[PDB]
From TrEMBL, chain A:
Protein name, per record: ATP synthase subunit alpha
Site, as annotated: Required for activity: 146
Family: Belongs to the ATPase alpha/beta chains family.
UniProt binding sites for ADP 1: 148-149
Record keyword Lipid biosynthesis present: no
The keyword ATP-binding is annotated on this UniProt entry: yes
Residues binding ADP 2: 149
Positions bound to ATP 2: 206
Covered residues, full protein: 217 to 431 of 502
Function: Produces ATP from ADP in the presence of a proton gradient across the membrane. The alpha chain is a regulatory subunit.
ATPase F1/V1/A1 complex alpha/beta subunit nucleotide-binding domain location: 1-148
Lineage of the species this protein comes from: Bacteria, Bacillati, Bacillota, Bacilli, Bacillales
A single GO cellular-component term on record: proton-transporting ATP synthase complex
Residues the record lists as binding ATP 4: 120, 149
Automatic annotation (TrEMBL), chains B, I:
Subcellular location: Cell membrane
Function: Produces ATP from ADP in the presence of a proton gradient across the membrane. The catalytic sites are hosted primarily by the beta subunits. Produces ATP from ADP in the presence of a sodium ion gradient across the membrane. The beta chain is the catalytic subunit.
Residues of the full protein shown: 356 to 471 of 473
Protein name: ATP synthase subunit beta
Family note: Belongs to the ATPase alpha/beta chains family.
UniProtKB/TrEMBL annotation, chain D:
Protein name: ATP synthase gamma chain
GO terms of molecular function: ATP binding; proton-transporting ATP synthase activity, rotational mechanism
Upper taxonomic lineage: Bacteria, Bacillati, Bacillota, Bacilli, Bacillales
Protein purpose: Produces ATP from ADP in the presence of a proton gradient across the membrane. The gamma chain is believed to be important in regulating ATPase activity and the flow of protons through the CF(0) complex.
Principal subcellular localisation of the protein: membrane
From TrEMBL, chain E:
This protein's name: ATP synthase epsilon chain
Sequence positions that bind ATP: 16, 22, 25, 32, 48, 55, 59
GO CC terms, sorted: plasma membrane; proton-transporting ATP synthase complex
Residues of the full protein shown: 68 to 131 of 133
Subcellular location: Cell membrane
Bilayer-crossing regions: none
Gene that specifies this protein: uncC
Taxonomy, superkingdom: Bacteria
Length: 215, 116, 118, 284, 64, 71, 71, 72, 116
């Protein structure tokens, strides 16, 4: 992968302005190729570790706190970053820059301040849950709560035709698995689509560092 | 799987899967009890109590706390012991026979001294 | 005055002792002090001690105080109930059910406890 | 620790407490009607018991095949379970006791046969691959004599074909609202038949053997129906006790969750005011 | 039938009243219909209440 | 009903002191009839808006805040 | 028991500085006998009422508090 | 159930005091049993009469806009 | 009723009542089935499907995507249409032909366009 990737590292021993300026340096390196017509992917491996460093250098510059002692412009801190990840028009050159920010949550609390600041910026989200991670489902993508906002216009047509009914089968399994925890033995059609959904779950598992092509 | 091996990894992940399913069943057990589980969830609970108690171990340092001399379990023997618990080989033993015990033969001899 | 100069046993009724604590919290918020646990003044236990350590029995007489407590949010671990309860000696739970039954006074016999019942 | 999540968990377990309390009340009413059916059945059972006593125990009369003890080549089993769940150990105690006796004294699949009453026992013996001849499924809450009459007639006539050579019943005896003990009762042959108070002699109008041939199946059918009414009463009492224990467990969960709710709302109030006064002190 | 000089009682498995040999068969044909209507009504009422309990404990398990 | 009703209004677009002084104007109009022997009903539609407006005035006057930043 | 014990009291009505220095006076009176070779028992009745008073004494010094508003 | 008037009874006229004190009890017995009436026959005479009178006093206490009813 | 009228208020209110009654039957329909639905509720689901499909329109905007020209439905005609669905006048029509139509005459013209 190092034939085409750039790794920007601002580590924990480095001062707080380097963790503050690491994603913006990554986006400037991405925009160099975006405004040449190339397609760039940018991954911020913890964007909730940028907010702590920006909180640090704001509170040490004697700026007043807010919720959870973050400053006022922490939404603007992430949104000024993430709105530079666009897909340009054909007059601008045609290049894009897709972003993948990460946010670590605390005990699954997606209603915290930095998760709800970054959820409201991105074009959808992918929920990784330990409750599904330790049930065998790895990758731990909660396919019900994970939203794609572009979705369908992103996919190719062959993925579209069959994902449209994958989603229905898996949503039916998620709805009817609740009535199979205890009790009184659901009938044959409901058990047929429970078996359909369990095989859907076994399809959607993968292993580590081996991606699959689209076909 | 590339570090601890394949068998170690499957035993570890199946241990974690049964303990996660038992953690999911905690609320149904808390309100409605063991009575309504659908005969595989009863087996999940029945094995996960044994797995949760065979994670506990007597220490050399804890001899001053309890008088029990304490153990040193190699990796092959704890993988073999948890694999034999997952296979159903020790479902007949009581669950208090698995507490504070080094290897799985000591589970057998402690259940023997309990009177099973 | 009637405890000291007269030397007799005096009752001292404080209706809603919680209003004392929250008025202290309001005076502390007006005075500009940094708030303590929850919304209470830093001097919550000290103000409550300076109130309820003069309600004592001396060699002259006594002052015994019957006090009403609000217990906000149905929470007996809230600091304003929790610092009053460190000074109480008896509780007389008045119940609606015993009042509708025809029992006067409506003191719930099982809920009412006392430190002196020994 | 997620004050809103604690309050949603409190409201969910209050809703489960309400639902299990409603099911407790429904099972109290059904227990009342089941013990009314038992006390309406009891004079028929008293009269047929004293008639069977005076006939089969007076002046010999042991010539009938349901009085003699024949050597057992097979052994029937009549298991009375519930159709519906949410009883605690109504079904499981009976099915475990039947499984223990069959695996303890037969060790052969052709040496026994099982007659289930209920879907729970039927699915139990189909999971464990045991032969089940008669099946009866989906009884009412308050069963009358007709449905159990056809299956009890099939059971006693299948004893009369020379198949079973003996059979046992297994049900839950309604001792109290809490107990529901499990009884093993031997249905046929009628060897343990007890004598009544006033042993009277009848004039058997065709003969005693013909009236035994027509009457002892009706005594066995009345035994099956009395056991089934006792089992339905113990079923509704067990579901009543199970839902009472469910409401008690739910209410204990409510009080521990309100303790956690009070700790979390206290932490939320002090955390928010520490933030507000820190933002106020930051300006000076 | 067992007859004593004051105990001429009759033990019948099904005893109608309407003084005709086939009215017990007609009553059995009506009560079989009423009986399987009740046998379905009791089962669907239990399964409705059990669906209420299963959804209410679903929401408890989701609430975590 | 407008033969015997007085209406006092302070909208959301009005300044926060008018929101703060609306109910005191209400009782100032009511006490004049109360101390003449008449009977008055005074209706305070959303005093929580008055609480928010006096919170706003005390915080812009930088009086020290309390619980939920109310003074 | 008063032939060998010492009672060090700082009651509920006393100011928070005397509540803050009661246990330190307890060990300071115990270590006189500890470092002479004797054996000393020291009982602290309600150290949570020491922690509350140090919370008071530090919030009045305007020190920024942590969990449960403790310093 | 949650609302309260701390004057109430001293406020009402004499014709309302005789009649409102049992509608309070009917609403109490109905709102404690409203969640138990979706399924099952609880009791045929003692509980269903409470549910009947409660489901009718809920319909008594409903009004529409701008039609105040005199206390008579 | 002061703002919309009395007829509009009672029609929209009965629509809300039958849709609430259909929402509180969803677990019963999805698990137990349509056959166990205890009729005088099967009529509720029969009318509520036709109501919740008649709530959808063909938009003028979506003409470019579907070809269907789009409609502007006044309030008197939609109150009359939902009143005629609540009266049971169009229970004989299929469950479709309410999808993506403007008025209630378009329902019967689309239903006879499908042979009904």
């Amino acid at each position: 992968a190092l034939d085409y990737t750039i790794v920007v590292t601002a580590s924990a021993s480095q001062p707080a302005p380097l963790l503050f300026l690491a994603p913006y340096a990554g986006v400037a390196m991405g925009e160099y190729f975006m405004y040449k017509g190339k397609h760039v992917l940018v991954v911020y491996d913890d964007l909730s570790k940028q907010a702590a460093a920006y909180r640090e250098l704001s509170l040490l510059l004697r700026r007043p706190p807010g919720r959870e002692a973050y400053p006022g412009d922490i939404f603007y801190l992430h949104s000024r970053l993430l709105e530079r990840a666009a897909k340009l028009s054909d007059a601008k050159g045609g290049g894009s820059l897709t972003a993948l920010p990460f946010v670590e949550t605390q005990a699954g609390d997606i209603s915290a301040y930095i998760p709800t600041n970054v959820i409201s910026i991105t074009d959808g989200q992918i929920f990784l849950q330990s409750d599904l991670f330790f049930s065998g489902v790895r990758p731990a993508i909660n396919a019900g709560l994970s939203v794609s906002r572009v979705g369908g216009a992103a996919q190719i047509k062959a993925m579209k035709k069959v994902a449209g009914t994958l989603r229905l089968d898996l949503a039916a399994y998620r709805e009817l698995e609740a009535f199979a925890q205890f009790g009184s033995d659901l009938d044959k059609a409901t058990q047929a689509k429970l078996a359909r959904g369990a095989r859907t779950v076994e399809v959607l598992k993968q292993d580590l560092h081996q991606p699959i092509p689209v076909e | 799987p590339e570090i601890v091996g394949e068998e170690h990894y499957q035993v570890a992940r199946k241990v974690q899967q049964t303990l996660q399913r038992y953690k999911e069943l905690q609320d149904i057990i808390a309100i409605l009890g063991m009575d309504e589980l659908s005969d595989e969830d009863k087996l999940v609970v029945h094995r996960a109590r044994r797995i949760q108690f065979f994670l506990s171990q007597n220490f050399h340092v804890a001899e001053q706390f309890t008088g029990q001399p304490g153990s040193y379990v190699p990796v092959k023997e704890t993988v073999r012991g948890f694999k034999e618990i997952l296979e159903g080989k020790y479902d007949h033993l009581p669950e208090d026979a698995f507490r504070l015990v080094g290897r799985i033969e000591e589970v057998v001899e402690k259940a023997k001294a309990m009177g099973v | 005055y009637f405890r000291d100069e007269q030397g007799q046993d005096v009752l001292l009724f404080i209706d809603n002792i919680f209003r004392f604590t929250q008025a202290g919290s309001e005076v502390s918020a007006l005075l500009g002090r940094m708030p303590s646990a929850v919304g209470y003044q830093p001097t919550l236990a000290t103000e409550m001690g300076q109130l309820q350590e003069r309600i004592t029995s001396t060699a002259k007489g006594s002052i015994t105080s019957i006090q009403a407590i609000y217990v906000p949010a149905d929470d007996y671990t809230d600091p304003a109930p929790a610092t009053t309860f460190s000074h109480l000696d008896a509780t007389t739970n008045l119940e609606r059910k015993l009042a509708e039954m025809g029992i006067y006074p409506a003191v719930d016999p099982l809920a009412s406890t006392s430190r002196a019942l020994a | 620790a997620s004050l809103r999540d604690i309050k949603t968990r409190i409201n969910a377990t209050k809703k489960t407490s309400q639902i299990t309390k409603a099911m407790e009340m429904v099972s109290t009413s059904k227990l009342n009607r089941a013990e009314q059916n038992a006390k309406s059945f009891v004079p028929y059972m008293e009269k047929i018991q004293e008639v069977v006593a005076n006939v089969a125990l007076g002046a010999g009369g042991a010539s009938h095949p349901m009085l003699v003890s024949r050597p057992v080549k097979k052994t029937g089993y009549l298991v009375i379970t519930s159709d519906r769940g949410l009883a605690g150990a109504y079904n499981s105690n009976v099915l475990r006791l039947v499984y223990q006796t069959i695996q303890k004294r037969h060790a052969s699949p052709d040496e026994y046969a099982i007659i289930v009453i209920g879907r729970v026992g039927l699915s139990f013996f189909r999971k464990r691959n045991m032969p089940v001849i008669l099946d009866i499924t989906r009884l009412p809450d308050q069963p009358s004599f007709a449905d159990i009459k056809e299956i009890a007639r099939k059971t006693v006539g299948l004893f009369a074909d020379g198949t079973f050579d003996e059979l046992y019943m297994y049900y839950n005896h309604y001792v109290s609202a809490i107990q529901q003990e499990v009884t093993e009762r031997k249905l046929l042959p009628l060897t343990d038949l007890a004598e009544n108070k006033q042993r009277t002699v009848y004039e058997f109008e065709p003969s005693q053997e013909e009236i035994l041939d027509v009457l002892l199946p009706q005594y066995a059918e009345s035994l099956i129906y009395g056991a089934l009414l006792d089992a339905k009463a113990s079923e509704h009492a067990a579901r009543m006790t199970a839902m009472k224990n469910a409401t008690d467990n739910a209410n204990e969960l409510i009080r521990t969750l309100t303790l956690s709710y009070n700790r979390a709302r206290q932490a939320a109030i002090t955390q928010e005011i520490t933030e507000i006064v820190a933002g106020a002190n930051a300006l000076q | 039938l067992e007859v004593r000089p004051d105990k001429v009682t009759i033990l019948a498995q099904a005893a109608e009243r309407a003084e005709d040999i086939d009215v017990l068969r007609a009553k059995a044909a009506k009560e079989r219909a009423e009986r399987r209507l009740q046998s379905q009504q009791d089962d669907i009422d239990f399964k409705r209440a059990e669906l209420a309990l299963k959804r209410a404990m679903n929401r408890l398990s989701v609430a975590e």
